[PDB]
């Protein structure tokens, strides 16, 4: 199907005399494939997928140099931001960015992305056209002007349409056994009385990959949108994900409820019922 490559970057200044910390994590869909971290004491703290290890030192050294240089850019960014926002040098602040590309099943580019946040609030992002900036805050007008004078959108666009797509296609092939395999959810339905008038029906989904899933509860074929409780999708710790949807139903009316499970790994969607 379709695939995405994303890098999730963080640069954080720290309390007192503490050195800033820099991290870059690359994902293909929900699979982490590389991690660069200034806190890393050895290659073990910069884990990488086996299909990245196979690229050898030319790849690793080139990406390590890019990370090291990007860290110099982020140090200046952190200093400029404290100036824009009239903040003390003593504070700890966080700069993050997410960037990368989406391709269809044929490998053709669908969309490029490049967004930045400061202290967890959107700051500036490349528009979908990859030719202009959208500024979330007043101060981002300053960055936008500097980036217009330096033709940064053209450079980011070249990477997003070119390098990003070519390498995403390469990783999908080299890591095909893990990246192109969709694990369907393992499902079940549990019942939990709450009172002598009502009970909770909980629809479970475990062991699925990718994280994207749709769990709905229906009454007589009708969607129960307002009354469905959905937990945030959570990692199992083995690359798979978990989620549940719950509905409070009247005692005796459980046969009227069905759980609908939609996932890319399923040949056909599931319709589930409580089976005592």
């Amino acid at each position: 199907g379709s695939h995405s490559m994303r890098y999730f970057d963080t640069a954080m200044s720290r309390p007192g005399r503490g050195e800033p910390r820099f991290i870059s994590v690359g994902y293909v869909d929900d699979t982490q494939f590389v991690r660069f971290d200034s806190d890393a004491a050895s290659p073990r703290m910069e884990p990488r997928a086996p299909w990245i290890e196979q690229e050898g030192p030319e790849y690793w050294d080139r990406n390590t140099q890019i990370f090291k240089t990007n860290t110099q850019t982020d140090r200046e960014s952190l200093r400029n931001l404290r100036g824009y926002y009239n903040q003390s040098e003593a504070g700890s602040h966080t700069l993050q960015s997410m960037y990368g590309c989406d391709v269809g099943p044929d490998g053709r580019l669908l969309r490029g992305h490049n967004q930045y946040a400061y202290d967890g609030k959107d700051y500036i992002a490349l528009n979908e056209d990859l030719r202009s900036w959208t500024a979330a805050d007043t101060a981002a007008q300053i960055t936008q002007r500097k980036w217009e004078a330096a033709r940064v959108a053209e450079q980011d666009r070249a990477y997003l349409e070119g390098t990003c797509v070519e390498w995403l296609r390469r990783y999908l092939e080299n890591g095909k056994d893990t990246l192109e395999r969709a694990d369907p959810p393992k499902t079940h339905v549990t019942h939990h009385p709450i009172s002598d008038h009502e009970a909770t029906l909980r629809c479970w989904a475990l062991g699925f990959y990718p994280a994207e899933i749709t769990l709905t509860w229906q009454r007589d074929g009708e969607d129960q949108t307002q009354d469905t409780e959905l937990v945030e999708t959570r990692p199992a710790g083995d690359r798979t994900f978990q989620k549940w949807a719950a509905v409070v139903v009247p005692s005796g009316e459980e046969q009227r409820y069905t759980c609908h499970v939609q996932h890319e790994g399923l040949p056909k969607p599931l319709t589930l019922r409580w089976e005592p």
Binding site: G26, F36, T69, Y116, K146, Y159, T163
Partner: peptide, 9 residues
Amino acid sequence: ELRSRYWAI
């Protein structure tokens, strides 16, 4: 493959 960023915020 990482993107090289040179221009600061």
